Scaffold this active site. Structure first.
Site, PDB file in Angstrom:
ATOM      1  N   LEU D  16       0.606  -1.256  -0.091  1.00  0.00           N
ATOM      2  CA  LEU D  16      -0.136  -0.054   0.114  1.00  0.00           C
ATOM      3  C   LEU D  16       0.718   1.294   0.128  1.00  0.00           C
ATOM      4  CD1 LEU D  16      -2.351  -0.895   3.126  1.00  0.00           C
ATOM      5  CD2 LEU D  16      -2.740  -1.144   0.492  1.00  0.00           C
ATOM      6  N   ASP D  62       3.818  -9.950   9.763  1.00  0.00           N
ATOM      7  CA  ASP D  62       3.835  -8.907  10.804  1.00  0.00           C
ATOM      8  C   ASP D  62       4.938  -8.506  11.337  1.00  0.00           C
ATOM      9  OD1 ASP D  62       1.340  -8.209  13.218  1.00  0.00           O
ATOM     10  OD2 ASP D  62       3.224  -7.413  13.361  1.00  0.00           O
ATOM     11  N   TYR D 155       3.436   7.226  18.884  1.00  0.00           N
ATOM     12  CA  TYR D 155       3.893   7.455  17.340  1.00  0.00           C
ATOM     13  C   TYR D 155       5.292   8.204  17.652  1.00  0.00           C
ATOM     14  CZ  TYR D 155       3.655   7.831  12.501  1.00  0.00           C
ATOM     15  OH  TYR D 155       3.935   7.555  11.093  1.00  0.00           O
ATOM     16  N   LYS D 159       9.114   7.022  16.432  1.00  0.00           N
ATOM     17  CA  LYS D 159       9.830   7.496  15.388  1.00  0.00           C
ATOM     18  C   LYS D 159      11.364   8.183  15.735  1.00  0.00           C
ATOM     19  CE  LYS D 159       6.801   6.549  12.707  1.00  0.00           C
ATOM     20  NZ  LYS D 159       6.903   5.134  11.975  1.00  0.00           N
ATOM     21  N   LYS D 191      -0.497  11.810   0.349  1.00  0.00           N
ATOM     22  CA  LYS D 191      -1.822  11.393  -0.287  1.00  0.00           C
ATOM     23  C   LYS D 191      -1.955   9.930  -0.493  1.00  0.00           C
ATOM     24  CE  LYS D 191      -5.347  12.792  -3.666  1.00  0.00           C
ATOM     25  NZ  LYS D 191      -6.510  13.014  -2.531  1.00  0.00           N
ATOM     26  N   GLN D 251       9.773  25.545   9.237  1.00  0.00           N
ATOM     27  CA  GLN D 251       8.882  26.587  10.144  1.00  0.00           C
ATOM     28  C   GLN D 251       8.846  25.950  11.435  1.00  0.00           C
ATOM     29  OE1 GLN D 251       5.395  27.383   7.966  1.00  0.00           O
ATOM     30  NE2 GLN D 251       4.298  25.590   8.505  1.00  0.00           N
TER      31      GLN D 251
HETATM   32 MG   LIG Z   1       8.132  23.909  13.443  1.00  0.00          MG
END
Ligand SMILES: [Mg+2]
Ligand SMILES: [Mg+2]
Lengths: 251, 251, 251, 251
Positions: D16, D62, D155, D159, D191, D251
């Protein structure tokens, strides 16, 4: 209390806002302080507002003025004894993208924000090394040393420069056993009279997409981290960035 | 002096080294302190060495023990009133590359260094939010939250995890007006009795290619940055990393 | 193959080492290229060594020369059509600590490494925006945009400046839908004829405490990441740092 | 063209979105590929959609399943010869702040996003080292390895862990001359059909305060940086983070 016992500090741009709060807390913690500004009319008032001449004095100086740096160190030493602590806080901003920055704007901003910090750092190392002073150079960056702002192009350049230059100096001082530490402080947005004079500015700065705390800081927020960095409490901290930004750079 | 007036702090792994120095300076600055360790035999001695029971007590707890966390907060509140300050300092190390890490080593280290910090952070937010305490959670990383070490694979994983998890928590607390700040502290190498017991370790850590200052730190170096972060002096600092490493990560 | 179909690139300092490899791979991948150098005697040779005049040409230019930048863009457009790609690669070094940097050295290095990159970035945005070119500005930093070196003070300043200035420009270009991306590339140590001429340099650079791979890179290492960044393959990459350093900054 | 000549790649979560695009471009560039997913019903379809069994196959696995990792490497070697390239891409998310994360959610997410990446990295090093393969391990982080998100607590932990663990592994592999590189890739928002199924998600992700480009990426954006990292073009890149985020973290 007495956390800066015996220290002698120069604070550039020390008559207003962040610089003035640093000066105030430095005096409170036992340091002698020389504050600067390009102008004469504000400085004497500002010094007297903090303390007496045996605690704090003013010296007119534009930080972009290389020769004026020797004069500033000499005046401070005459008043208070050898300088132990330098806060390079003087800075300006140009509200332009890189694309729209004129060369004159570019050179003017770099003269204060980059050349001035270099002149101060270079001279500070030379004057403060090898004297058992627990010397500390604190270079004022901001959040714009970490992240871009599309309308602060030259400012970003200057803050990125100071961020990494400071690491070079820290390393050389450490490797040569100079007894000089060099670190940077990175304020987010801080409420001052100048910000108050700009309609809508504090509100825009306080939006959660800018400052997650939903409000901006105050000059003492930056003063207190500077006390820690000037103090012998931070004798193992060098070459590092100290961020006080209400979460700005955390998202 | 009195920089932590009225604060009530839990310090995990507070019986030795860095944790003990944090406890010592916290008590000196007016905080009440509960220190922990997995063991019982060291903790009572360590507490009494710092101060009296109205200042500092011990609670036996393994930070990987989820249910023990409620018990720890309840004991601290019973002794001293609502907890305002949590220092997640308990940690272990496995001296293995990623390649050579067994799954048992992996799970054991993560249980203390990652799960334990999560349990403490999650419970601390729940217990300290919305009480006007000026609450502060200080999560102990190290230089190994920024840079790899080829022989500290699982340790690196844990410190990177805590570094960024802490930012998530800081942001949520700020956005929700919880009156809880979350920051990480990143020591370089620090001299302790445990380091002294490892032949050649301090010397190796002190080589200029490791620590540019040519020597390692001491527990109070980490204590002082923790005082700043627990204190209301740092009320605008959240989501940030505070590095005290003798220049290790600057090169 | 044909990964830079239709692109027109300017590469400053493109006659030697990294710049020449970038030029070589750019031509191989279908870009037209204008390379520069302050000098005339090397440039024509270097261009012909890579390809024919319909593929690659030389233009004498010192990147610190503001007015020469318009002339360079005009010559490139005349030869090849509108410029889509700018690699700001020209740079110099001063082997001095901050403490020992003369003001003349400071200004000279900043003129090439900072002013020159600003002039190129500013003009590149103006000339390349809003033309559907998939425009890309690649600003050459190095590892010294991330970490200090005690004997590269001004160089560190310049690389830190370019690192964060580039983010400002990236953001403004993105927010204004200019179709211009801006990113930085950060080589570690790379073997070139100039390094070969410095006795002991490659060996020192190859020590594991410097480069963990135990050897240094080669110009094509930097060429290939530049191809990716010039190519439409990287159309979602902007404001980021791309590091190719043999592990230097990972420890 | 043929940029991955002779390479044999495992891509976890390769059926996917990002993983599937990586698989597609890998096959296009001459690699043989084994894709995985926890499920069976999607994998065979997905493989056939990309190419024939001599190019790409599916293996149900898995990534949290430690023993299944040996089986996966053995199946890939049987199909295609020794594995040269591992993309640890399988991951899940829990939409909870740290405060609101259950322990079950915590352990489930870490099992896939942290343990799974460790299992793959550890086994990959063991299986790919010292074989002259130009081996490359590409560990999928995201922007949430750099910055917090208040509603992605676990999460973020995962990461951040993968970001720094990967540096440890990179260093050990480099120092031991293993011919294995380890790097991380950090997508912003991309997307996919899953994002399309979440009402309002792409629009929220595309706000300028999130993604400065004003739109999100596409799976091929991540595929192309992975091709570079799997290819011998990146033979001097190890221990580094490669960010493709539309300006999110700038930013
Ligand atoms: Mg920032
Ligand atoms: Mg380093």
């Amino acid at each position: 209390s007495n956390r800066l016992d015996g220290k002698v500090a120069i604070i550039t741009g020390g008559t207003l806002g962040i610089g003035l709060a640093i000066a105030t807390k430095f005096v409170e913690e036992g340091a002698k302080v020389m504050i600067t500004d390009r102008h004469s009319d504000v400085g004497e008032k500002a010094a007297k507002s903090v303390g007496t001449p045996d605690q704090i004095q003013f010296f007119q100086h534009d930080s972009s003025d290389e020769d004026g740096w020797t004069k500033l160190f000499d005046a401070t030493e005459k008043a208070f004894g050898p300088v132990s602590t330098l806060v390079n806080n003087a800075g300006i901003a140009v509200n332009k993208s890189v694309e729209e920055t004129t060369t004159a704007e570019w050179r003017k901003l770099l003269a204060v924000n980059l050349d001035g910090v270099f002149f101060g750092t270079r001279l500070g190392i030379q004057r403060m090394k090898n004297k058992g002073l627990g010397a500390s150079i604190i270079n004022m960056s901001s959040i714009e040393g970490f992240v871009g702002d599309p309308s602060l192009g030259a400012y970003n350049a200057s803050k990125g420069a100071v961020r990494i230059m400071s690491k070079s100096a820290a390393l050389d001082c450490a490797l040569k056993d100079y007894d000089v530490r060099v670190n940077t402080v990175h304020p987010g947005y801080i409420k001052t009279p100048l910000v108050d004079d700009l309609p809508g500015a504090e509100e825009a700065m306080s939006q959660r997409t800018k400052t997650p705390m939903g409000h901006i800081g105050e000059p003492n927020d930056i003063a207190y981290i500077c006390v820690y960095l000037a103090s012998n409490e931070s004798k193992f901290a060098t070459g590092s960035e100290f961020v006080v930004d209400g979460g700005y750079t955390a998202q």
